[PDB]
């Protein structure tokens, strides 16, 4: 009964997420992989676009690649910055609203 | 994005960051070397 | 992007340290044979012309 119900949940999640997830990895060609580089992966929907990349803008400038492909009313995206700017990058996001 | 291009330079880097360190750890050992021959 | 510039010059600046340190040690090691072998070839001798003054004289009361 709980290997079942376990189970429901697998399929469900696992069908809702493979759309997001292949969306921002299509995009993030491996980012997470180096501490070169982070990567942030966020969804936003174009709603959001304008004012996530404003608060995104404020603090990295243009040392942060912003970067979306679509996953159907919004756009995965990537905020990518560079290793020691991980901390205002997550702070951006949250600010708009979006979050990694 | 960009991303795939700042996902090779980071390795090139990487790797010029490696090739530092054998040939600094080679200088201690060429050292090493004749420290014990001078000795010797 | 502005992304790989700094991480370019990230990466070289320890290039740089890993040479120049690993030198700078071997100078340091260095200077410790250096040391140690011109104070030990000093002090073998020493005792030996010790153990020759004394010896003769010891010749020379027989």
Not at chain 1, 40 to 47: A, C, D, N, W
Request: without cysteine; aromatic residues 2%; hydrophobic residues 45%.
């Amino acid at each position: 009964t709980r290997q079942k119900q376990e189970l429901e949940e697998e399929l469900a999640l696992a069908q809702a997420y493979l759309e997001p997830l292949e969306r921002l990895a299509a995009l993030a060609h491996g980012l997470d992989k180096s501490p070169f580089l982070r990567v942030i992966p966020f969804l936003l929907t174009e709603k959001e676009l304008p004012l996530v990349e404003e608060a995104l803008r404020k603090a990295l400038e243009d040392r942060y690649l912003l970067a979306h492909e679509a996953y159907a009313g919004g756009v995965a995206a990537l905020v990518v910055v560079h290793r020691k700017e991980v901390d205002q990058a997550k702070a951006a996001l949250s600010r708009a609203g979006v979050a990694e | 994005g960009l991303i795939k291009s700042l996902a090779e330079k980071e390795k090139q880097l990487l790797e010029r960051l490696e090739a530092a360190k054998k040939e600094a750890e080679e200088r201690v050992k060429r050292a090493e070397a004749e420290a014990k021959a001078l000795l010797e | 992007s502005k992304l790989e510039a700094i991480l370019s010059q990230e990466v070289e600046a320890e290039i740089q340290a890993l040479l120049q340190e690993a030198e700078a040690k071997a100078e340091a090691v260095k200077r410790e044979a250096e040391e140690k072998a011109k104070a030990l070839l000093q002090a073998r001798e020493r005792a030996l012309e010790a153990q020759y003054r004394a010896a003769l004289r010891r010749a020379e009361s027989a």
